[PDB]
């Protein structure tokens, strides 16, 4: 018959990353998670206690709860036509930070600098990010570089 288990069909999913087997390195446990941090869930197949279901692999959530060995995680899960807000209990082997907030705070501070700097510079800030523009004009110099005429090439077997 059919089988739907708790860890069912996770064969390749919890595997241990070839030549990364063995004991977990110890900066995993030196990392301090706080309420309001955003973290990414990648399971660690060697640590069974505190291990999230195969739905939460790769999902990203916020820390509402900090406890002895574990942290709280709020996920938004699609069921039916709506999103439910899930709370999860996971040990810090299965968590790590997501760098989008580190990079976001780096740009927040730079934006603070530029503005307050530009506050004595008479505005004209241009503090947004703008997409890659169409490339402006230019003049190539053929001097030293001569256009090399190319043409299609005949067919051959070469077997």
């Amino acid at each position: 018959g059919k089988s739907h288990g708790y860890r069912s069909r996770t064969r390749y999913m919890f595997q241990r990353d070839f030549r990364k087997h063995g004991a977990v390195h110890l900066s995993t446990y030196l990392k301090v998670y706080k309420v309001g941090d955003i973290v990414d869930i990648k399971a660690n197949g060697s640590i069974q206690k505190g291990m999230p279901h195969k739905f939460y692999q790769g999902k990203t959530g916020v820390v509402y709860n900090v406890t002895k060995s574990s942290v709280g995680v709020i996920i938004n899960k699609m069921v039916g036509n709506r999103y439910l807000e899930k709370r999860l209990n996971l040990r810090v082997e299965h968590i790590k930070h997501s760098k989008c907030r580190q990079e976001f705070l780096e740009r927040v501070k730079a934006n603070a600098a530029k503005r307050a700097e530009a506050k004595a510079q008479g505005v004209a800030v241009q503090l947004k990010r703008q997409p890659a523009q169409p490339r402006e004009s230019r003049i190539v110099s053929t001097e030293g570089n001569v256009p090399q005429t190319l043409a299609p090439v005949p067919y051959e077997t070469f077997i």
């Binding site: 938004n76 039916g80 036509n81 999103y83």
Partner: protein, 58 residues
């Protein structure tokens, strides 16, 4: 007299009619699940800081 048992066809299309509504998440979320030991102290932290101004505010 067998039937047609399972299909997912039309289900994603019915899903977007009213279309995947959001958490409607709030300031001050619920403290369900928060550490009871932190939560006990947090009672008295707020309990004290309210009266903190009751000495100043009068």
């Amino acid at each position: 007299a067998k039937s047609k048992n399972h299909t997912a066809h039309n289900q994603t299309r019915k899903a977007h009619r009213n279309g995947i509504k959001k958490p409607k998440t709030y300031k001050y979320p619920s403290l369900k699940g928060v550490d009871p030991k932190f939560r006990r102290n947090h009672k008295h932290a707020l309990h004290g800081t309210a009266k903190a101004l009751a000495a100043a505010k009068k």
